[model samples]
Target: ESADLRALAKHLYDSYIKSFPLTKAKARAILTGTDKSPFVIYDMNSLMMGEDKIKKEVAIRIFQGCQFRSVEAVQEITEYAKSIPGFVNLDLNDQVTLLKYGVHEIIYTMLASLMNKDGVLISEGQGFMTREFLKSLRKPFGDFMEPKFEFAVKFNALELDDSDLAIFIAVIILSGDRPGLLNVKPIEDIQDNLLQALELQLKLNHPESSQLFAKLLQKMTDLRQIVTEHVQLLQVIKKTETDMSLHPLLQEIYK
Candidate 1:
């Protein structure tokens, strides 16, 4: 009985001259391809009416899941590069450059392209650079040169508030990939996570991240600049001996 009802409904729709009312409202449908086209038009209905179909649809094809695949893979590889012996001690740019090429290879492999094709991913390179640069600042020579450079690029330009600046410095010293990794008592958890995640074995374990981690890391600096310059807001990072009372949402803006 149910099948008979379904068949009858189908026959009525197929056999009858279905008269959708023709008024000013219906006239609008004639301008289907124009900007004035109605919102209710469905994808299936457009093909049914032979609307302007995409020509050479193959040209529009992009690698499926390319963005997600790149991001996930890059995250894993960066953690590895930090672990290499002398990786931290090398010239900051050299270390960063190594990471950048790793990213280039990963992305190129996924997209089937070349490294020189698109420019190096600057953020990943700089993130590693900034991390090492800050680490060097602990020493006397590093204190003078590295801090001066940071001032010129970051805080002097008002990139981050006082407190957030502490966190930024902490990332360089710790090289914590995901910020939340630092969660724990005494907030020394930040240092602990950094040591564990930044070993040579850990970084090499995920080679793709070495290429792109700097790019992701660089965003923190860029974000500092954007917030400092545009929003007229400043973040002040403080030590609570536990957790800093920073706004997580705004913190993302700095990243």
Candidate 2:
């Protein structure tokens, strides 16, 4: 009987694992140097003028500090996001502030969750570099504005497939960095371009990323549903009303 029960348990575990469409093999393909995310090499010294210079400086700093990816290149791309007015400012210190404010934690959690789901966790220099770079941003930039997921969608203009979106949203949820803008678009034209790029990389036709996109959209939708459920309960409370006994409950409800 004990042997039979053990076999049953193993079967259940295997079945559960198989239920997830994204598997270790798929994850490896999506993450390990894919064509869509080809290495972006850049000349560090060449970006000496305008915002490109700032990105070059930051990327270099990040590479020096962590040596994850082509620091200069990451900086160049991130700079495109920063160029948008109001989303972020040009102060180097502010950039650091943003990293310290939990962006790194958010990204780490997101990536880790995805890796776990795919059963394919591995060390990647680029991952470390990207996390450190984002951490620096939080330190100098502070947190992104509220409604962060929405902000990220608007800012990055992601056009992920259903599966990839699901994975993305799961990571964001786990990171606890929803309700603020992480990366905003500079202009409508630029935003459109970004969306197009993402579509190319993450659309349904891209079997590698389709699951991740779906997951992201579903996660966001779930968050909205949860928030909606509390509508009537929230109305019972008042801004100035004092109720010490309900404080913990209130906090849990929000979280």
Candidate 3:
């Protein structure tokens, strides 16, 4: 049974990755402006010319980029969840509840997949902003980024592939402990199956690495803490930044 689930998971993962390949070029396009209408100007002289305004704009731009990317990832995750056998059988309210609470954690986890040692690839490869630069953004904006960078750096060290990421995200989505879950038993069973499948896949994929599965499980704990910090920062942003608002989708989920 586990083997059958594992095969299904692998197939779904492969299809997802194929459909959404996060290549360097693609990331650059998303982070920086594209050739036609770039996201960020990426001009040193211009940025320095209007230093404060530019920095603020850049911060907002990056924030928008992060929000957009996170939202897209959540949408994809939602699709993936529906694709999983029996996942849609849960109560609709419980499904929405799981997605609302689970999406931020999953977003940050997927963000880790895009990171490198120096920092995340923001603009084109030419513009690799370090964690320090990210913190330099305006108050709560910068605060939102710090914990994610912290998590991404350590998580990237594990060197997981797309397949591993897919299964792990599935486990996160099917979590049984979320508040207001009506059918915890079925969800818990799915999570257990996913966890077992993940362990076996890790062993098969990383033969030389004996502790990868345990380490990944530990990272899930770390991710929960990181997401808690993120939520606190979002709370602060919502309370203070009345002039600005999170994307409506994010507002709904974060609220």
- Best-fitting candidate, measured by TM-score? 3
For candidate 2, what is the lDDT?
A: 0.33
Task: Give the lowest summed-lDDT range of ten residues in model 2.
Answer: 138-147
Across 108-226, the per-residue lDDT of candidate 2 in tens digits comes to 22333323211212233222122222333422221211222333333233333333332232223222233443433232333343333333335534566545444444544534443
lDDT tens digits, residue span 102-198, model 3:
8878778877655554456543233345666677777877787677778887887777777787788778888899988888998998788888878
Off by over 4 Å in 2: 1-114, 117-189, 200-204, 207-215, 218-255
Best prediction by lDDT: 3
RMSD each, Å? 25.7, 20.1, 4.8
In model 2, what is the error at residue 177, expressed in angstroms?
13
Off by over 4 Å in 3: 1-6, 23-56, 122-128
What overall lDDT goes with each candidate model?
A: 0.31, 0.33, 0.71
Q: At residue 98, what lDDT does model 3 achieve?
A: 83
Q: What's the TM-score of each model vs. the native?
A: 0.20, 0.25, 0.81
